[PDB]
Amino acid sequence: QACHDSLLDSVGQTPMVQLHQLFPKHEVFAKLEYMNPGGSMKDRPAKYIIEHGIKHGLITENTHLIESTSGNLGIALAMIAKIKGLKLTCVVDPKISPTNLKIIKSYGANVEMVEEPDAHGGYLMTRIAKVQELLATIDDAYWINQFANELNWQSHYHGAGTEIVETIKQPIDYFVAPVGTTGSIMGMSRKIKEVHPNAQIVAVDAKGSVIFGDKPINRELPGIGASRVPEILNRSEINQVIHVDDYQSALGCRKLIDYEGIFAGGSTGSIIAAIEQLITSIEEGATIVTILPDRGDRYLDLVYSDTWLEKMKSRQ
Amino acid sequence: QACHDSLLDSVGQTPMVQLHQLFPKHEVFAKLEYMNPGGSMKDRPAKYIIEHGIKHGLITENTHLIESTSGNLGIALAMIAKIKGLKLTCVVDPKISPTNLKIIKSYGANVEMVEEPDAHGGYLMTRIAKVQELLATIDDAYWINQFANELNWQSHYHGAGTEIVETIKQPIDYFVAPVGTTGSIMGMSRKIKEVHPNAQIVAVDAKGSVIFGDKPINRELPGIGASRVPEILNRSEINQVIHVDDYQSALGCRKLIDYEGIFAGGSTGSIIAAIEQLITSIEEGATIVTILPDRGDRYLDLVYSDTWLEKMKSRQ
Numbered sequence: 368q369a370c371h372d373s374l375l376d377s378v379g380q381t382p383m384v385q386l387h388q389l390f391p392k393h394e395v396f397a398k399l400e401y402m403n404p405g406g407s408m409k410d411r412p413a414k415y416i417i418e419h420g421i422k423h424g425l426i427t428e429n430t431h432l433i434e435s436t437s438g439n440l441g442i443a444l445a446m447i448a449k450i451k452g453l454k455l456t457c458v459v460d461p462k463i464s465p466t467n468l469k470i471i472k473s474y475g476a477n478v479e480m481v482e483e484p485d486a487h488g489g490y491l492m493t494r495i496a497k498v499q500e501l502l503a504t505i506d507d508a509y510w511i512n513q514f515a516n517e518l519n520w521q522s523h524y525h526g527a528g529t530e531i532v533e534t535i536k537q538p539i540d541y542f543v544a545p546v547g548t549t550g551s552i553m554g555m556s557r558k559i560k561e562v563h564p565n566a567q568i569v570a571v572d573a574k575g576s577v578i579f580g581d582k583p584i585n586r587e588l589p590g591i592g593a594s595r596v597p598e599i600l601n602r603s604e605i606n607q608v609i610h611v612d613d614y615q616s617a618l619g620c621r622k623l624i625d626y627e628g629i630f631a632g633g634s635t636g637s638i639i640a641a642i643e644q645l646i647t648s649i650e651e652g653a654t655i656v657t658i659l660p661d662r663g664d665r666y667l668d669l670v671y672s673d674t675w676l677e678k679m680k681s682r683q
Numbered sequence: 684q685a686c687h688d689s690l691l692d693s694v695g696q697t698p699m700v701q702l703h704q705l706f707p708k709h710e711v712f713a714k715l716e717y718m719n720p721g722g723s724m725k726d727r728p729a730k731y732i733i734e735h736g737i738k739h740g741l742i743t744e745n746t747h748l749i750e751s752t753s754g755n756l757g758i759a760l761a762m763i764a765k766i767k768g769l770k771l772t773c774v775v776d777p778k779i780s781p782t783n784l785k786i787i788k789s790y791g792a793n794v795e796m797v798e799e800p801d802a803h804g805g806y807l808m809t810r811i812a813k814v815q816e817l818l819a820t821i822d823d824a825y826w827i828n829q830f831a832n833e834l835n836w837q838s839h840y841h842g843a844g845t846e847i848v849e850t851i852k853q854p855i856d857y858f859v860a861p862v863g864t865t866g867s868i869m870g871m872s873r874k875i876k877e878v879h880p881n882a883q884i885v886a887v888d889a890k891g892s893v894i895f896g897d898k899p900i901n902r903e904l905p906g907i908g909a910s911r912v913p914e915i916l917n918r919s920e921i922n923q924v925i926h927v928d929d930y931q932s933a934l935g936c937r938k939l940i941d942y943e944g945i946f947a948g949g950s951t952g953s954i955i956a957a958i959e960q961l962i963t964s965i966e967e968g969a970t971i972v973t974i975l976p977d978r979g980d981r982y983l984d985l986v987y988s989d990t991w992l993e994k995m996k997s998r999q
């Protein structure tokens with residue numbers, strides 16, 4: 368191993384682990400994106416978007432980064448911004464995890480907490496409006512714009528997507544990924560299908576997410592699911608869509624830690640639930656590749672709380 | 684990169700990063716032990732002790748692991764126990780981090796919380812007694828015994844110690860490590876001095892820790908510092924001892940994240956404070972190697988709480 372000159376050099380090249388115990392009749396490979404130094408998969412677009420902007424003169428040391436975020440992208444941006452010497456303001460709402468908020472603040476990022484919900488309860492439109500307000504009033508700014516920025520999916524194309532095809536050189540029969548912005552499934556599937564053109568691309572979403580037009584219900588988990596259809600998404604590149612509810616997702620997390628000792632976050636539970644559904648239809652022995660976006664540490668009062676689990680069971 | 688057959692294969696081979704910004708006049712290399720898959724340096728002894736016991740027939744699938752622990756070793760043991768199919772009971776007290784406790788429980792470990800303090804307030808003697816009670820009543824048990832188990836320092840000798848000398852082949856002028864059980868500084872210094880016999884070995888402890896006979900005061904940080912002199916410790920192998928108080932440690936954490944974007948735990952702050960003291964005495968340009976045991980995520984209500992920081996400032 369060589370010395371890194373900064374923490375940036377340890378982004379990527381994350382482990383790939385076969386889930387022998389959880390999936391004894393298929394060859395299931397899990398890309399451990401949560402082992403990125405910032406703690407989640409969002410290290411990939413944070414590093415890639417900011418470095419691209421700097422290289423091409425859109426971002427200088429004077430440029431103020433702006434984004435509306437839940438925890439994970441906020442934390443990743445804050446880490447990269449801090450390393451690069453850039454100001455960052457995260458637009459957030461009162462639904463953000465209290466611990467994720469403290470982490471963002473620890474990295475020295477500014478936080479703009481919106482307080483007014485719309486007449487109907489959501490803070491989405493309020494956050495959208497606050498981002499535009501900041502772009503109007505903070506001179507020299509760069510909007511990360513994760514739902515529309517092509518650099519998002521490109522980061523995953525060059526990131527785990529490239530590492531997946533280097534490692535899993537055997538045919539990939541199914542690639543299974545959770546969706547939020549869809550940057551991950553778009554970028555990784557594009558890279559995968561260059562090498563494995565017959566790979567089936569399987570999106571996993573939360574029940575109540577509007578990405579693929581499910582009927583909206585209250586959703587507890589971050590990361591997976593969205594309240595908008597992302598501009599990034601090209602539906603024709605998706606071959607199968609599986610929705611999983613929050614109880615299902617949480618059971619998936621608890622099963623993964625029980626069977627493999629892997630302590631992962633909500634959306635990882637979602638893809639465990641979805642792969643268990645998928646394997647009732649596909650061929651025994653299939654090669655399945657998936658990604659595990661973040662750690663269980665960010666879900667102690669969600670998935671890994673027994674009282675929360677019982678409440679989600681009741682929602683079914 | 685190759686596929687791992689389990690999470691165990693991703694223990695170790697952690698990044699080494701030069702701290703160019705924080706230490707512009709010395710060559711300071713930080714071993715990122717917090718990037719172990721379980722989240723801290725304690726992955727090393729947990730894996731090594733348990734695998735050694737299994738190899739040598741002291742531990743079978745029926746053997747119940749016992750240890751009195753604060754968070755980090757408890758979490759690491761729980762992860763390894765879960766992967767190996769072993770029962771684990773952690774003896775803990777009410778001072779344990781609420782979040783670390785939830786993490787231990789998430790990994791399916793049993794928890795024995797002691798409630799009676801001694802007449803003088805500490806739970807140390809109560810925990811010591813509870814461990815012996817469990818060893819008496821739980822047939823087929825294995826006491827991890829971290830303060831006395833030679834496998835503790837051996838794990839660090841074979842672990843980061845070996846990786847440090849492989850990577851830092853240039854002369855190591857100073858090796859700086861925090862002490863708790865002293866397994867890390869004993870094992871790593873032993874390996875380092877095989878290659879670099881003139882390396883000076885610098886222990887960093889918390890003010891109020893009795894490891895090197897400081898006057899006891901109330902201590903806020905886990906990991907670094909102890910309320911016993913560890914059997915593992917051989918003082919003759921220590922060349923310099925620096926004590927740092929909790930305010931100093933916390934300023935070190937905040938400076939490290941501000942200068943390098945590295946979000947590390949309390950004892951990392953301790954060794955930043957200690958290295959800043961050390962460099963007032965040593966030669967410019969010296970090569971210093973250190974270890975960063977855990978992440979800032981476990982210190983949001985400690986080091987990274989502004990109100991907590993002000994309270995520690997008042998303790999000086």
Ligand SMILES: *Cc1c(COP(=O)(O)O)cnc(C)c1O
Binds near residue numbers: 409548551632661
């Ligand atoms: C970002 C994220 C996702 C979804 O990834 P996208 O690239 O936005 O589709 C899933 N889970 C977690 C935890 C995430 O942070």
Ligand SMILES: *Cc1c(COP(=O)(O)O)cnc(C)c1O
Binds near residue numbers: 863864867950
């Ligand atoms: C265990 C630990 C230490 C001290 O290491 P020892 O090998 O026990 O001396 C320091 N910091 C943290 C966070 C630890 O968990």
Ligand SMILES: [K+]
Binds near residue numbers: 494495498
């Ligand atoms: K927006």
Ligand SMILES: [K+]
Binds near residue numbers: 491592593594595
């Ligand atoms: K959304």
Ligand SMILES: [K+]
Binds near residue numbers: 810
């Ligand atoms: K004990």
Ligand SMILES: [K+]
Binds near residue numbers: 807909910911
């Ligand atoms: K102690």
Ligand SMILES: [Mg+2]
Binds near residue numbers: 387
């Ligand atoms: Mg097999």
Ligand SMILES: [Mg+2]
Binds near residue numbers: 506
């Ligand atoms: Mg300006």
Ligand SMILES: [Mg+2]
Binds near residue numbers: 378411525526527
């Ligand atoms: Mg990358």
Ligand SMILES: [Mg+2]
Binds near residue numbers: 703
């Ligand atoms: Mg230099």
Ligand SMILES: [Mg+2]
Binds near residue numbers: 822823
């Ligand atoms: Mg028995």
Ligand SMILES: [Mg+2]
Binds near residue numbers: 695
């Ligand atoms: Mg090791």
